[PDB]
Each structure stands twice: as C-alpha cells, then as structure tokens.
C-alpha cells in the first residue's frame, strides 16, 4: 500500500497566552512520529517505536535545527505581514513530504499557506514555485534566483525524505503495516413508509476503505466520513433509500479483501 512521510510547521504572530507561536509535527501515514514547539523548545517522539530506535544524538541534533526553523519562521511570517500591511495575529503553515507507492514510485511536495489559504506550491521537476498573488509572486522571484536552494529541496524530497520514510516504516512495521479487518454489518425506516439501508464498518486499519451500494453502482449514496475509534482503528458507513423491489447489496474493499453483504 502507498505510505507517506509529512512534516508540518505552524507559526502564529501575536498568539494568546499559552498558544505557542511555533509548532512542528511529523507524521508517517496518519500516525504522528515527532513533535516540537516554541514552549518545550525540544523535539520529542509521538510513537514509542520512534523513541526505541533513534538514539539521543537524533533528538539532540534536530532539536537544534528546529530551534533554527522556529527563528526562520517567525521572520518569514513577520515579513509577509509587512508585505500585506496586516497588523494583528495571522498564521503561516508549511507542509513537506513524500509518498512511497507500491509500484515503487515516489512523489514529493512542499507548500506554504498564509491564513490557511494556499500561498506557494513547489514543483521539484520544473524547479519552480507556483504563487497565488503579488506578494507570493515576489517571494517566488527570490527563491528561484537561488539555483542551489531549489536543487537542495529536489534532492531532499526525492532521496532523503524517502530514505527516512523507509526506516520509519521499518521501526514501526508492526503498527504501520498491520491489517485489522473491518466488522461490516447492515442495519435498517427513515420516516413512516420510506426505508433506508445503512452499511457500517468499524475496528479496521489502515483507515483507507472503499464502501458503496449496488444493484445486481447506485445514485444518491449518503457517505459518512472515516472517523477514528480511539483504539487506533477507524469506522465508516454508507446509507441509501429504496423506491417502495430491486435486489441491493453493500460492497466494501479494505487492504486487499473485497466483501459483499446482500
């Protein structure tokens, strides 16, 4: 199955009491693996299997880089606010990551948001930056003047990020690469006369599930989001109404297994 490594950075100018001006969290797939912030000024594991497999040298070195990234991030944000002539608190976000697909293929990405809206998206193949407005297009011209920076990123996305993903996937193989199959049951009268059919799944991992209704697809399937159960499994459902005598059935696909409940 596709696996991913993602690092997020959140920066907040003029934060409230308590609210850190900087947070940086790392995820493999939907599991968090690492945390840093302007309060703890320390990089910590958010999974025991990271904690067990990376020596103190690791947390020591990356604490220091993150204290650095915190500094750089306060300045990039303070500058953007000058550029827009924005007073008061605003936010700056960065997400970087790579997918290792099953075909053995790879993807890499890096983007920034200002106030939760897309600002700069990197293209590692054309070594260029897509910008949304004037102030963004200005930051692009600077970043593209630096051939060596653009090449550093492309190499990091394509080589480093995938090497990290691979050893993280090993450190946490029992958590990240297990399958817990889903419980799939179908329970049924949505108003007097009309009947709905609910296809429900729970206790499953990984969270990627396909669920639909068919006849022997079907139009107007009400789908429910994949939600976390709190035990590290997920749950999800699909509902559907019945013209008051066609033969219907719920189809579910998870982690290589296909199910039909008539």
């Amino acid at each position: 199955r596709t696996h991913s490594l993602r690092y997020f950075r959140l920066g907040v100018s003029d934060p409230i009491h308590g609210v850190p001006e900087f947070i940086s969290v790392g995820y493999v797939d939907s599991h968090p693996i690492t945390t840093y912030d302007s309060v703890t000024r320390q990089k910590e594991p958010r999974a025991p299997w990271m904690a067990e497999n990376l020596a103190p040298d690791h947390w020591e070195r990356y604490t220091q880089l993150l204290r650095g990234w915190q500094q750089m991030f306060k300045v990039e944000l303070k500058r953007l606010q000058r550029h827009y002539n924005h007073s008061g608190s605003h936010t700056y976000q960065r997400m970087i990551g790579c997918e290792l697909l099953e075909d053995g293929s790879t993807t890499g990405f890096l983007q920034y948001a200002y106030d939760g809206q897309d600002f700069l998206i990197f293209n590692k193949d054309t070594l260029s930056w897509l910008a949304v407005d004037n102030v963004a297009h200005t930051i692009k011209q600077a970043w593209e003047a630096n051939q060596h920076e653009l090449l550093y990123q492309k190499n990091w996305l394509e080589e480093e990020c995938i090497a990290w993903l691979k050893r993280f996937l090993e450190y946490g193989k029992d958590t990240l690469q297990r399958t817990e199959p889903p419980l799939v049951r179908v329970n049924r009268e949505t108003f007097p006369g009309v009947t709905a059919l609910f296809c429900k799944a729970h206790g499953f991992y990984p969270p990627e599930i396909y669920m639909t209704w068919m006849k022997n697809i079907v139009q107007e399937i009400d789908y429910g989001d994949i939600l976390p159960s709190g035990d590290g499994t997920y749950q999800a459902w699909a509902s559907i109404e019945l013209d008051p005598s066609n033969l219907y059935s719920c189809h579910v696909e998870h982690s290589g297994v296909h199910m039909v409940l008539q």
């Epitope: 000024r41 880089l65 204290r67 500094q71 750089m72 550093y152 090497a163």
Partner: antibody
Framework: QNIDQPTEMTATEGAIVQINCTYQ??????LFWYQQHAGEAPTFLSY??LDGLEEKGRFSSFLSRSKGYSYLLLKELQMKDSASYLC??????????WGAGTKLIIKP | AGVTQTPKFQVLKTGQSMTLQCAQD?????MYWYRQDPGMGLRLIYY???????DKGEVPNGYNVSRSTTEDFPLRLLSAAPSQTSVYFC???????????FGNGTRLTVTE
C-alpha cells in the same frame, strides 16, 4: 562517515588539474568545495547535490551521488590557484563533514 | 561586510583564560567555531542554529560559547593547554544547508 581527497597535487601553469573527493555516508544534502589560500579564510567555490557537472569560468565541479565521487576541475591554471581545496558534504543530520584538504602547488 | 574574528594572533601561558570574538552583520542564523590542524579536516568545536541556542561539535572539551544575539558568537578558552595550539576559524551560514562565510582566523599558541 569518511571522506578522502589527496594531500598534495602539483601542476604546470596553463594546464589542467582534477581534484578528486570520495565520501561514504547513509544520507546526503550536498557536496561543497572551498578554496583556502595560505594564511587566509576558506571561501565558497562550488555546491553540487544532483548528479552532473557545473561550470563557473575556469572552474568546474562534478558529482556522482551513486559512486559517492566529486571532482574540482581547474582549467588554464594560474599561480593564484596555489591554495588548499577543501571538500565537504552535509550528511542526513545536516552535519558538515570536512575532508583533510588538497594543497594545490602550481609550477610556473 | 562578512565575519570579523579577533584577535588574529594570541600566545597564552598554560592555564590562562581567553575570549575569541566573532561577529557578522549578515543576519546569518548559523555561526560555527572550528579548529584547523595539520593533516585533518576542520573540526567543529561548537555551533548555534539561532540566537538563544548552542550545541557541542566533535571537539567541545575545553571550550564554551554563547549566542545572546544574532550578531556575536564568542569562543572562550577556559584553561589554555598546549593541545589547543591551533588555528581557529568562526563561520556563519544563512541556513544548515547554505555556504559558510569564514572569518580570517586566530593563530593561537599555548606555552608552559
């Protein structure tokens, strides 16, 4: 986490010298060459991180990520190219690992 | 502009204390202290990813640093030893991955 470059190299004024640099690492964030004149501060020459060649004038830098190999190529040598040439790479942790340096002697 | 390092030369008696200054006007986030010695690469003593943080390099023993400001990264020799006879270079870089700008060095000799 080792790096090798030759101690000393000597070449005739007007000719060509290729300074080799090899490096074993599990992780790479780029290779640098710095120039250091006797009694002076090392100064930035070249950054390579993808495979291939870069050229700024009489100076070229090549990198093979796979072969873990770099060369600094100096054409049309001048007496002023007498200096130490330092190679360095960033590892996975962004630690800058320095070679022992190559002293380039130019014969007039 | 660049990195200014003082002094260029110092002799110390064994056990004396010594502050090497080093400053940059370039807004660099990283500053570094290296010693250069015949037959080996530069060896990192300490470094600093930003004002308010510092960390050991490969040869921290015998040295301390401070980074109260972006500008300044002083290196203090605590108790001077013969083995510290060396040439000291402090450097700055915009980022963990950008080119180092070096100062013009300190030639330092410790005699009993």
């Amino acid at each position: 986490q080792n790096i090798d470059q030759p101690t000393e190299m000597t070449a005739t004024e007007g000719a060509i010298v290729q300074i080799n640099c090899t490096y074993q690492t599990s992780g790479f964030n780029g290779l640098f060459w710095y120039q250091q004149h006797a009694g002076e501060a090392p100064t930035f020459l070249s950054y390579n991180v993808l495979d291939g060649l870069e050229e700024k004038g009489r100076f070229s830098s090549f990198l093979s990520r796979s072969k873990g190999y770099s060369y600094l190529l100096l054409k049309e040598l001048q007496m002023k190219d007498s200096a130490s040439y330092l190679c360095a790479f960033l590892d996975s942790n962004y630690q800058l690992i320095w070679g022992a340096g190559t002293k380039l002697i130019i014969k007039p | 502009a660049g990195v200014t390092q003082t002094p260029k030369f110092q002799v110390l008696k064994t056990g004396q204390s010594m502050t090497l200054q080093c400053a940059q006007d370039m807004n660099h986030n990283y500053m570094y202290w290296y010693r250069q010695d015949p037959g080996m690469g530069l060896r990192l003593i300490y470094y600093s990813a930003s004002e308010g943080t510092t960390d050991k390099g490969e040869v921290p023993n015998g040295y301390n640093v401070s980074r109260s400001t972006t500008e300044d990264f002083p290196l203090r020799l605590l108790s001077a030893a013969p083995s510290q006879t060396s040439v000291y270079f402090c450097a700055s870089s915009n980022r963990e991955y950008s080119p180092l700008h070096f100062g013009n060095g300190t030639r330092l000799t410790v005699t009993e």
